[PDB]
Design a protein around this ligand. Structure first.
Ligand code: A1EIV
Lengths: 298, 483
């Protein structure tokens, strides 16, 4: 896990006549057959590599391997050899990435109980257990399903678990190309500050504007060029503007690369909205501009 | 085959000698520009040529000189040095920068204003994040992630592309802690604008790859969905075409989990990437990498159990690009399956050895869906316990995706799925026992274990507790003519 230690070990091995082993991928649950084979040559069980290949053992089967499967299926007759293999498997399970399967970060809890307790994380996950479910687990269930053979570990886990466990605000009106970047930045900044904003990607359009607590149209460079002289209400952005005007939500336009269109060429509905003050967008100070917008907002 | 290297290595020697001997800022910048142009020309050929270039640079200590030029007060010398640095960060040079060169890059990350510095340090951070988990953790502890987010706030196309690829690389090579720290810093929210930007398709593709890799970490899928950037993944994948970007091994081994992620966006991203890589490989003669990794089996399983048109189409295209027969999708009505459907599922799950044994026993949908351990051990000749466990895993996967409407009367599959998505596999057992929603209030543990086949005691206890807690003169007549 350390660069310096790995480099020193690699140099020491290269000084001798030994092949350096390629580091194993920590995501053991996602291991394929090749990763299992490579771990096998690393732990010096190259004799059983062919047997593992025939059974097509992968990350899940290896991580849930049992005593009888080793004894019968994989031909590991010697009990001492099986114990050595299980010690190696415990060492592997201690250093494993369970994020693909762990949902409640149960590995962290098991490690907090004891660094050696983390090996049971995959068993507990495959049983479907999480942090919330451990309060009702029994000893027999642990032993039979989770594979915790040692009674002391089962008792410790049970006792420790029992003792420890017990209408968008803003809508965005933007152009297809020019307004996309500014709309994305505005929505992300508002979400970072705790403002819920719904940005889309006709009947659903009206309800989306109606449910918006505040309407903030993005006045991007040439944003209202399509909406200019749009008395036929052809543009969907025109529909959004008209619906917002009908609802009369809080309107705080953002000024960038475009000016207020002349009211006379515009319909009276958007003639009304042209009187609202706009806020200039600064690329040098984007977060400051967002802070100013929030200050002017509620 | 390497005469180009033969007459280019001396050119490297004079270039580096002049660059080192240069004392003026402009002369050093000119030398760095010459080296960068030579590296670019070699790249336009040559992977091995660039490898030989960087080997000589590392041997002559050129990267140390670049580091102390990064430490130099002159800004333009820094920009040329970082321009070279972005393109000389090969695996060995990446190890060298990790061991001794780290820490200097954080000083660059402190600088935020210049666009050229932003792009250069974004590329350098991308390569460093592709190095190893420890370097990713150290950079996350430093301001590298914050610098990436700030550059994502910016607008430059190349800078955004490098930032997206950096986030993807760090998500792939970071681990649990790195991804947790990323989400705590709201990585998906800042990934959203990069995917939303319609200016460049590659930027959105990389941002969606990063989002999918974050989503594969399913302990934080809740916050990833709260970000909402996962929504755009499917439409973008549907719109984009693999061929255009394809024309424009460890990476494949890391993309395979996305195929097996069981998350629709992640599966689609993995299918798109694997289809592009398969097209690129089939353009050459080397196509055994996918077989060695085992992604062919993952693609076949994806096709058989496909529920999305785009994902199924991408998987079919990827399989057809290689020399593999596409599997016909299975009919979800498993209880109504005949012998032929069972056989087809068997070749899909790669158990063609047992197809004849299944045929002799005349196994059909019901017998397959109620198959037991001892029947496999004795009747079907599945001696290996590991093989039996693999078969039962495949059968559980099948039972999760099954149409029980022909047998389910109270929609008990929906209730079991509401309890847990993995609990739906017991629906057929509970139905064949005659149980429904009303009858589950009186069921006992022993009855479940013996009849319903729920071997895991935890599942039985959860089902029992959840069931017990949750369950408790016509007006008008018509007179009409015949026709
Ligand atoms: O594949 P590897 O060795 O992990 O790293 C790739 C490295 O090659 C450079 N590069 C690749 C292609 C074309 C150009 S101009 C430059 C990138 O800057 C990266 O540092």
């Amino acid at each position: 896990t350390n660069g310096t230690k790995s480099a020193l070990a690699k140099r020491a091995l290269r000084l001798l006549g030994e092949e350096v082993p390629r580091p194993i991928l920590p995501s053991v649950p996602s291991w394929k057959e090749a990763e299992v084979q490579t771990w096998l040559q690393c732990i010096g069980f190259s004799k059983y590599c062919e047997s593992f290949r025939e059974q097509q053992v992968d990350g899940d089967l290896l991580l849930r391997l049992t005593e009888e499967e080793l004894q019968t299926d994989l031909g590991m007759k010697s009990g001492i050899t099986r114990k050595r293999f299980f010690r190696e498997l415990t060492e592997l399970k201690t250093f494993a990435n369970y994020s693909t399967c762990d949902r409640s970060n149960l590995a962290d809890w098991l490690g907090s109980l004891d660094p050696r307790f983390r090996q049971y994380t995959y068993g507990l996950v495959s049983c479907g257990l999480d942090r919330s479910l451990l309060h009702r687990v029994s000893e027999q269930q642990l032993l039979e399903d989770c594979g915790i053979h040692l009674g002391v570990h089962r008792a410790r886990i049970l006792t420790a678990a029992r003792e420890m466990l017990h209408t968008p605000d803003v809508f965005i009106s933007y152009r297809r190309n020019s307004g996309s970047q500014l709309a994305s930045l505005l929505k992300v900044h508002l979400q970072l500050h705790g403002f819920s904003v719904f940005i889309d990607v006709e009947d659903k359009l009206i309800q989306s504007v109606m449910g918006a607590r505040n309407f903030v149209l993005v006045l991007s460079p040439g944003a209202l060029d399509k909406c200019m002289q749009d008395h036929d209400c052809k543009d969907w952005v025109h529909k959004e503007i008209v619906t917002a005007l009908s609802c009369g939500k809080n309107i705080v336009p953002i000024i960038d690369g475009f000016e207020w269109p002349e009211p006379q060429v515009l319909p009276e509905d958007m003639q009304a909205v042209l009187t609202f003050n706009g806020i200039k967008w600064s690329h040098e100070y984007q977060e400051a501009t967002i802070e100013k917008i929030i200050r002017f907002l509620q | 085959v390497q005469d180009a290297l033969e007459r280019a290595l001396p050119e490297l020697q004079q270039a580096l000698s002049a660059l080192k001997q240069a004392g003026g800022a402009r002369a050093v910048g000119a030398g760095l520009a010459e080296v960068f142009q030579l590296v670019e020309e070699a790249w336009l050929l040559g992977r091995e040529v660039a490898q030989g270039l960087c080997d000589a640079i590392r041997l002559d200590g050129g990267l140390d000189l670049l580091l102390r030029l990064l430490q130099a007060p002159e800004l333009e010398t820094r920009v040329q040095a970082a321009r070279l640095l972005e393109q000389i960060l090969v695996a060995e040079n990446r190890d060298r920068v990790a061991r001794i060169g780290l820490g200097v890059i954080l000083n660059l990350a402190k600088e935020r204003e210049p666009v050229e510095l932003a792009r250069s340090v974004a590329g350098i951070l991308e390569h460093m994040f592709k190095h190893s988990e420890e370097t990713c953790q150290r950079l996350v502890a430093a301001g590298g992630l914050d610098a990436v987010l700030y550059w994502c706030r910016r607008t430059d196309p190349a800078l955004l592309r490098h930032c997206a690829l950096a986030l993807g690389n760090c998500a792939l090579h970071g681990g649990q802690a790195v991804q947790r720290r990323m989400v705590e810093k709201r990585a998906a929210e800042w990934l959203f604008p990069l995917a939303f930007s319609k200016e460049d398709e590659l930027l959105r593709l990389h941002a969606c790859l990063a989002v999918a890799v974050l989503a594969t970490n399913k302990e934080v899928e809740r916050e990833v969905e709260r970000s909402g950037t996962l929504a755009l993944v499917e439409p973008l994948v549907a719109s984009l075409d693999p061929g255009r970007f394809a024309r424009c091994p460890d990476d494949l081994q890391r993309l395979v989990p996305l195929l097996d992620s069981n998350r629709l966006e992640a599966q689609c991203i993995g299918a798109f990437y694997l289809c592009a890589e398969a097209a690129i490989k089939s353009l050459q003669g080397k196509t055994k990498v996918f077989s060695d990794i085992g992604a062919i089996q993952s693609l076949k399983r994806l096709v058989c159990y496909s529920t999305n048109g785009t994902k199924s189409a991408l998987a079919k295209r990827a399989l057809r690009l290689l020399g593999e027969e596409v599997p016909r999708p299975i009919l979800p009505s498993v209880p109504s399956w005949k012998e032929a459907e069972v056989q087809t599922w068997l070749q899909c799950i790669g158990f063609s050895k047992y197809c004849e044994s299944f045929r002799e026993q005349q196994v059909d949908g019901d017998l397959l869906l109620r198959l037991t351990e001892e029947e496999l051990q004795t009747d079907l000749g599945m001696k290996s316990g590991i093989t039996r466990k693999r078969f039962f895993r495949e059968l559980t996967e099948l039972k999760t995706f099954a149409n029980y409407s022909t047998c389910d009367r109270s929609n008990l599959a929906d209730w079991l799925g509401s309890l847990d998505p993995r609990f739906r596999q017991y629906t057929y057992g509970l139905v064949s026992c005659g149980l429904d929603r009303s009858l589950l209030h009186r069921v006992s543990e022993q009855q479940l274990l013996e009849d319903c086949g729920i071997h895991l005691g935890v599942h039985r206890a959860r089902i029992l507790t959840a069931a017990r807690e949750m369950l408790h003169t016509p007006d008008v007549f018509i007179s009409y003519r015949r026709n």
